[PDB]
Amino acid sequence: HMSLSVAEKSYLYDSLASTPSIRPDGRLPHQFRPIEIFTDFLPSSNGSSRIIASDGSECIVSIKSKVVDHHVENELLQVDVDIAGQRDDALVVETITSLLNKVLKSGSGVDSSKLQLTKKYSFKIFVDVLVISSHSHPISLISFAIYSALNSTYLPKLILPTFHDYDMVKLDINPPLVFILAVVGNNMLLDPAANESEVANNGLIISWSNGKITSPIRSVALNDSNVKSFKPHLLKQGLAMVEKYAPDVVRSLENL
């Protein structure tokens, strides 16, 4: 986990930088850890999701909606992130919030037209994230939970706007996924464990939508101890790795 000794860090790094890389649990560089997801458990919300990882990292996402004038509210999708044990003022929380807001920007994050009701009114989507537990960078965790929540989100059906009392339409949209990668030496790792993230030379946040490597893309320090520079071919490796191993995450998440 976090706060490993120098000996532990050296061992882990040597295993993770060797060719091929030896991950502490024997995972392949592109292999994810077992997670499970539940949806539709919050009746009051339009959508809902809960994701649990094998290391204990647990996240909860709620999808709510409200009618707004486009003209007065140009942003039809707002992401609010609440991490337990972290104040709303915290740097990492606002960073994640900004990032997620950009991945999901109505501009080109998702298709804004799917939200439109009338030429003057639409549904604003409130995505509320509650990170119960996290031992690594929760950006992918949150992203996946949001994906699941949006793919199981139902909205009131239109018939000033008036709505059907009992019938609701499934929100149809292709939600984006955000991936996190660990750069260790000359090796790229998907779904980095806490101990892996403690010794990683750097990190790559790579967004993904409709089967394309989309923005935002970030380089992110997974720690402060071993942050080193990296060669561009590694960045290319990460991108290729995502676009190679993303459609299976998409088909795994979208099969219900």
Partner 1 sequence: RRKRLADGLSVTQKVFVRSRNGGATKIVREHYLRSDIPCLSRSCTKCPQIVVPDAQNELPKFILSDSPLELSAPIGKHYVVLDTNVVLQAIDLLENPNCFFDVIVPQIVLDEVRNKSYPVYTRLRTLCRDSDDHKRFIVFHNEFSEHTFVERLPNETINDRNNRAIRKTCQWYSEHLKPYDINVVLVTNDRLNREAANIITKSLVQYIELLPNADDIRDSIPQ
Partner 2 sequence: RLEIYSPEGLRLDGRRWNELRRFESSINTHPHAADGSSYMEQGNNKIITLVKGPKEPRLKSQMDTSKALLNVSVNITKFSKFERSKSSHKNERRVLEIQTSLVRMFEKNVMLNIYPRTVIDIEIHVLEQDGGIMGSLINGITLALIDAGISMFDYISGISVGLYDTTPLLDTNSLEENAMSTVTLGVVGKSEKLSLLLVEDKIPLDRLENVLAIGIAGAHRVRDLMDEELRKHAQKRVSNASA
Partner 3 sequence: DSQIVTPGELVTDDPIWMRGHGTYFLDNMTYSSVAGTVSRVNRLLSVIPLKGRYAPETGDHVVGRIAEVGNKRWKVDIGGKQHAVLMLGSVNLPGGILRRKSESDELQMRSFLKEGDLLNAEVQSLFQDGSASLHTRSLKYGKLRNGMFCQVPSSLIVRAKNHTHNLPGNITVVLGVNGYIWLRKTSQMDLARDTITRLEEESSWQIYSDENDPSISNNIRQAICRYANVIKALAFCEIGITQQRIVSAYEASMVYSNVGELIEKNVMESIGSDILTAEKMR
Rule CB under 8 A: which residues touch partner 2? 42-45, 55-56, 58, 60, 62, 64, 66, 80, 82, 84-85, 88, 126, 128, 130, 132-133
β-strand pairing of 121-133 with 77-83: parallel
Cβ at position 64, least distance to partner 3 in Å: 33
Q: How many other C-beta atoms can be found within 10 angstroms of the C-beta atom of residue 11?
A: 14
Distance (Å, whole) CA 214 – CA 216: 7
Q: Which does 126 bind (CB under 5 to 8 A by kind): partner 3, partner 1, partner 2, none?
A: partner 2
Q: Are the CB atoms for 94 and 155 separated by under 8 Å? A: no
Selection from 228, 224, 223, 33 nearest residue 140 by Cα: 33
- Which stretch, 18-26, 64-72, 124-132, 150-158, contacts partner 3 (CB under 8 A)? 18-26
Q: Which of 22, 84, 169, 240 binds partner 3 (CB under 8 A)?
A: 22
What string of H, E and C letters represents the secondary structure of 137-193? CCHHHHHHHHHHHHCCCEEEEECCCCEEEEEEEECCCCCCEEEEEEEECCEEEECCC
Nearer to partner 3, 128 or 198 (CB): 198
Cβ at position 23, least distance to partner 3 in Å: 7
Distance (Å, whole) CA 186 – CA 138: 24
Cβ at position 233, least distance to partner 3 in Å: 25
Phi and psi at residue 195, to the nearest 5°: -65, -35
Q: Which does 67 bind (CB under 5 to 8 A by kind): partner 3, partner 1, partner 2, none?
A: partner 1
Cβ at position 75, least distance to partner 3 in Å: 40
Q: Which of 38, 41, 54, 92 binds partner 3 (CB under 8 A)?
A: 54
User: Contact residues for partner 1 (CB under 8 A)?
Assistant: 43-44, 46, 65-67, 156, 160-168
Q: Which two tokens stand for residue 233?
A: 């071919």
Positions that interact with partner 3 (CB under 8 A): 3-8, 10-12, 14-15, 18, 22-28, 31, 33-34, 54
